[PDB]
Amino acid sequence: ASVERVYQKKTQLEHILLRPDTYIGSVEPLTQFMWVYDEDVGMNCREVTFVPGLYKIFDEILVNAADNKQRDKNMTCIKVSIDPESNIISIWNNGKGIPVVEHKVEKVYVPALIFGQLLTSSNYDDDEKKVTGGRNGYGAKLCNIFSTKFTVETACKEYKHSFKQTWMNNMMKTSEAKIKHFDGEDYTCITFQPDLSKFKMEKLDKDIVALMTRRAYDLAGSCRGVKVMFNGKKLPVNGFRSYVDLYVKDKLDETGVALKVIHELANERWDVCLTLSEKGFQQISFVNSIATTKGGRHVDYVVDQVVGKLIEVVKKKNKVSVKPFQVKNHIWVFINCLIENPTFDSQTKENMTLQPKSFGSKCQLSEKFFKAASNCGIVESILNWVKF
Amino acid sequence: ASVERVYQKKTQLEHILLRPDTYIGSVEPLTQFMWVYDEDVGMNCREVTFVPGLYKIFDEILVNAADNKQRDKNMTCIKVSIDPESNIISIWNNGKGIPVVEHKVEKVYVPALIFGQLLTSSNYDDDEKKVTGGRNGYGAKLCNIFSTKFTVETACKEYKHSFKQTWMNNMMKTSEAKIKHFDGEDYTCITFQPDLSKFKMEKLDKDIVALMTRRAYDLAGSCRGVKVMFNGKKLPVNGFRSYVDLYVKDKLDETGVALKVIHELANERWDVCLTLSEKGFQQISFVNSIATTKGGRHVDYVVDQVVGKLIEVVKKKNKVSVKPFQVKNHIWVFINCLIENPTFDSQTKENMTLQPKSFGSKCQLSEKFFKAASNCGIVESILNWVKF
Numbered sequence: 001a002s003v004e005r006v007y008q009k010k011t012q013l014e015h016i017l018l019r020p021d022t023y024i025g026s027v028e029p030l031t032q033f034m035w036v037y038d039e040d041v042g043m044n045c046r047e048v049t050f051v052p053g054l055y056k057i058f059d060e061i062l063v064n065a066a067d068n069k070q071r072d073k074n075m076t077c078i079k080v081s082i083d084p085e086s087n088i089i090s091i092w093n094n095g096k097g098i099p100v101v102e103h104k105v106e107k108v109y110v111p112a113l114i115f116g117q118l119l120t121s122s123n124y125d126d127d128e129k130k131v132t133g134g135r136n137g138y139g140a141k142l143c144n145i146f147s148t149k150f151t152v153e154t155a156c157k158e159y160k161h162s163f164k165q166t167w168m169n170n171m172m173k174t175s176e177a178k179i180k181h182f183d184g185e186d187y188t189c190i191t192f193q194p195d196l197s198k199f200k201m202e203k204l205d206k207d208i209v210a211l212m213t214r215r216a217y218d219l220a221g222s223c224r225g226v227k228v229m230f231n232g233k234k235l236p237v238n239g240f241r242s243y244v245d246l247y248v249k250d251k252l253d254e255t256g257v258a259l260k261v262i263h264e265l266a267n268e269r270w271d272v273c274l275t276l277s278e279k280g281f282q283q284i285s286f287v288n289s290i291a292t293t294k295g296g297r298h299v300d301y302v303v304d305q306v307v308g309k310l311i312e313v314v315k316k317k318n319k320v321s322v323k324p325f326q327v328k329n330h331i332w333v334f335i336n337c338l339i340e341n342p343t344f345d346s347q348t349k350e351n352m353t354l355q356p357k358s359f360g361s362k363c364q365l366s367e368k369f370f371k372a373a374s375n376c377g378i379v380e381s382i383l384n385w386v387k388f
Numbered sequence: 389a390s391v392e393r394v395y396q397k398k399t400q401l402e403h404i405l406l407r408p409d410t411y412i413g414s415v416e417p418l419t420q421f422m423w424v425y426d427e428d429v430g431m432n433c434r435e436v437t438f439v440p441g442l443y444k445i446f447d448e449i450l451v452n453a454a455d456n457k458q459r460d461k462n463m464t465c466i467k468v469s470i471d472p473e474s475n476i477i478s479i480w481n482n483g484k485g486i487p488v489v490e491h492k493v494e495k496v497y498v499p500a501l502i503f504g505q506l507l508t509s510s511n512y513d514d515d516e517k518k519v520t521g522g523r524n525g526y527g528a529k530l531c532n533i534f535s536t537k538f539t540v541e542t543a544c545k546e547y548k549h550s551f552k553q554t555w556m557n558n559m560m561k562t563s564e565a566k567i568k569h570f571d572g573e574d575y576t577c578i579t580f581q582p583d584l585s586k587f588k589m590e591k592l593d594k595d596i597v598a599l600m601t602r603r604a605y606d607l608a609g610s611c612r613g614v615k616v617m618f619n620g621k622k623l624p625v626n627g628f629r630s631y632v633d634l635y636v637k638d639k640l641d642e643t644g645v646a647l648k649v650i651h652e653l654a655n656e657r658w659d660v661c662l663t664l665s666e667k668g669f670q671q672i673s674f675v676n677s678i679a680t681t682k683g684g685r686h687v688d689y690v691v692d693q694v695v696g697k698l699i700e701v702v703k704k705k706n707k708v709s710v711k712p713f714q715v716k717n718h719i720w721v722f723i724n725c726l727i728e729n730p731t732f733d734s735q736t737k738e739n740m741t742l743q744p745k746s747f748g749s750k751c752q753l754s755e756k757f758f759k760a761a762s763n764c765g766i767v768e769s770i771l772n773w774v775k776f
């Protein structure tokens with residue numbers, strides 16, 4: 001093989017399609033136990049088979065909608081629609097639209113720039129301490145690139161215009177945006193047909209729909225001051241506590257006793273629930289409405305506090321050595337937090353790596369919370385084991 | 389703020405410096421328990437404070453050296469040198485050098501292309517099933533970008549020339565390469581001065597040196613047929629088993645009994661050691677000489693087999709319910725494997741996401757191995773707990 005065939009240069013766009021895993025995660029099927037929202041049983045834990053990259057291009061658009069609550073605190077509503085037969089997904093939000101005007105540096109309409117060109121963002125100035133999930137300027141373009149059809153509609157009353165542009169064929173084709181006069185209430189609606197051939201799928205099947213549906217419930221629980229609709233029906237979730245209830249309200253421990261769930265809203269930026277786990281350490285956590293499915297420093301930050309205080313309680317009774325990992329093994333923690341300018345080791349944002357001193361806020365759990373944590377059955381499970 | 393200040397486009401190079409976490413990991417200090425190789429005690433587990441991105445730019449160059457064993461099976465040696473006082477790190481390997489000739493498409497010398505331009509690689513053709521660690525065409529440029537001085541020396545007898553080019557100031561400055569006549573044994577030497585200001589460090593301190601040193605021992609253990617030298621001394625590690633010995637050969641369980649370590653080289657591509665853990669699940673694993681420090685499907689693939697067989701043994705004696713996570717909680721597994729065209733969710737390659745059916749090989753552990761695994765004290769720990 002010649003030098004020119006062995007050593008190759010790729011464009012950014014080529015690289016995304018060649019190496020999708022670092023941008024959206026695996027484009028191959030994955031089977032694992034997790035929580036989804038099914039049509040027949042609602043929230044439940046089961047084996048699910050899905051393609052991570054498909055989940056993630058949906059998630060990018062969903063989190064972008066959530067992020068608009070930080071641009072416009074008056075935003076009230078996100079609407080999610082999924083139609084497997086037509087293969088059409090739409091995510092709509094109110095609050096301020098996107099400026100329908102030509103960017104004077106880039107010489108294109110602002111929505112065309114930030115949905116149709118890589119590395120474009122309103123989150124590149126870190127002197128502003130934002131609790132948006134958006135950080136890198138890729139998400140929306142990644143969804144576009146993995147869609148056969150990708151449509152952006154937005155209306156910005158400030159500029160008195162609406163904007164509609166459609167891309168097709170993995171962001172490789174587009175056409176002149178339709179601009180009109182607009183004097184109503186702002187909105188943005190992203191409508192896309194995912195390119196199922198990129199994920200070796202024939203249709204949006206029940207498992208991927210159940211996962212996408214659960215993310216809508218996640219958002220109802222995590223995104224304060226925003227109501228969520230799914231396929232035309234408002235979700236009956238109002239606050240993180242009611243969201244946590246979907247997991248633990250009807251649940252018993254192995255001895256037949258209802259799980260005791262304890263909650264502290266430490267401040268506006270930190271909501272924490274804790275209960276007993278009997279299947280090893282479990283965490284459900286959100287940073288700026290991103291599901292941090294590998295955890296991160298925010299999880300460790302909260303859990304370490306609990307583990308420390310519970311070792312004190314067990315030590316007042318362990319009259320041998322109780323190790324942190326044994327305590328952590330009995331914890332099921334739920335965390336909803338807002339972190340200033342978070343960092344992650346991947347675009348998929350499963351693991352939040354920002355150190356706590358940089359969070360912009362603290363979550364020091366009260367002594368009342370710790371007293372309750374010492375009574376939710378975690379201490380008893382440990383003390384029962386101190387005998388063996 | 390105006391449209392042009394709010395909505396910004398970045399170049400690829402700008403984005404790497406603005407958002408380093410997705411390319412090299414956190415540029416902030418991290419403190420955690422882990423294994424390093426210290427000057428006074430050798431291999432040990434302790435709290436270590438280091439900057440992940442600094443570790444990773446070193447690792448990129450080290451794995452690139454390991455990868456050359458796949459270009460030239462005759463390669464025998466990698467030499468690592470770290471001088472904290474001068475701030476100079478050098479990684480040298482023999483076997484075939486890099487072609488010292490002008491790339492006819494890109495119109496630059498091949499080494500200048502693949503060390504000085506983003507998205508350049510010999511690993512972009514996946515029709516070839518390679519067990520290199522290199523996949524994305526970033527690594528070497530990332531080290532260059534986070535170095536104040538970055539030098540590439542290579543000699544390719546086939547082309548009868550040597551090549552030397554130096555970059556400076558985060559890959560923003562360079563000068564004409566020095567080409568000479570060469571008729572000796574090929575080599576590549578990468579020498580760099582990391583830009584410690586990017587990591588808020590004054591010097592290569594003991595902790596980062598101990599971690600970098602351990603990676604050299606990792607490579608001696610993981611990279612078959614390649615001897616490793618560190619600061620002028622060959623490392624006394626010959627094969628994965630002798631490497632594993634550095635962790636467990638002198639170790640006792642909590643009852644004062646030496647850890648029983650069991651080993652199977654299933655085939656050329658899979659080497660597996662297993663022993664008892666008393667601090668929850670532990671894994672040390674390598675894919676194509678990358679330290680997979682978050683694990684991946686290769687870890688689950690091996691562990692699931694063990695967990696399945698051990699539940700059978702415990703069930704022949706558990707005359708209640710022993711759950712997989714409880715068995716996994718007593719396992720310390722060591723894995724060295726070669727995976728065809730692996731995937732990862734990040735450039736840092738901590739988590740290998742390729743599904744096992746795509747590995748290019750299998751690791752079905754023998755019945756002899758499983759019999760031994762049922763006697764290394766994992767079953768006894770479980771059975772002891774079945775009483776409580």
Ligand SMILES: Nc1ncnc2c1ncn2[C@@H]1O[C@H](COP(=O)(O)OP(=O)(O)NP(=O)(O)O)[C@@H](O)[C@H]1O
Binds near residue numbers: 137
């Ligand atoms: N629903 C929306 N309403 C208003 N602005 C939006 C909306 N969706 C996207 N945007 C804007 O479009 C930009 C590009 O989105 P995106 O490509 O996801 O980048 P990002 O969110 O800034 N960072 P990331 O998601 O980490 O890659 C964002 O920075 C926002 O300014």
Ligand SMILES: Nc1ncnc2c1ncn2[C@@H]1O[C@H](COP(=O)(O)OP(=O)(O)NP(=O)(O)O)[C@@H](O)[C@H]1O
Binds near residue numbers: 527
């Ligand atoms: N020591 C070396 N000997 C020979 N070729 C090398 C060496 N180091 C780097 N290269 C070549 O330089 C190219 C660029 O290296 P790099 O930028 O690390 O990309 P990569 O290894 O292919 N992929 P990645 O490490 O996943 O970003 C490699 O693909 C190799 O062809």
Ligand SMILES: CCCc1cc(=O)oc2c(C(=O)N3CCCc4ccccc43)c(OC)cc(OC)c12
Binds near residue numbers: 052285292
């Ligand atoms: C590649 C996508 C992985 C993934 C995606 C997802 O959406 O959820 C997950 C959950 C999961 O169901 N949830 C429930 C609410 C959201 C959440 C937040 C943090 C942790 C877990 C969860 C999960 O629970 C074992 C495990 C998961 O992967 C290991 C995933």
Ligand SMILES: CCCc1cc(=O)oc2c(C(=O)N3CCCc4ccccc43)c(OC)cc(OC)c12
Binds near residue numbers: 413420421681
């Ligand atoms: C951001 C870099 C993280 C990291 C880097 C590293 O180099 O090592 C690690 C080890 C670690 O020391 N080793 C020993 C041989 C290499 C290896 C392979 C897989 C798993 C662990 C290990 C570790 O052991 C708890 C934990 C680690 O991070 C959570 C890291």
Ligand SMILES: [Mg+2]
Binds near residue numbers: 060064133135138
């Ligand atoms: Mg985004």
Ligand SMILES: [Mg+2]
Binds near residue numbers: 448451521523527528
């Ligand atoms: Mg490389």
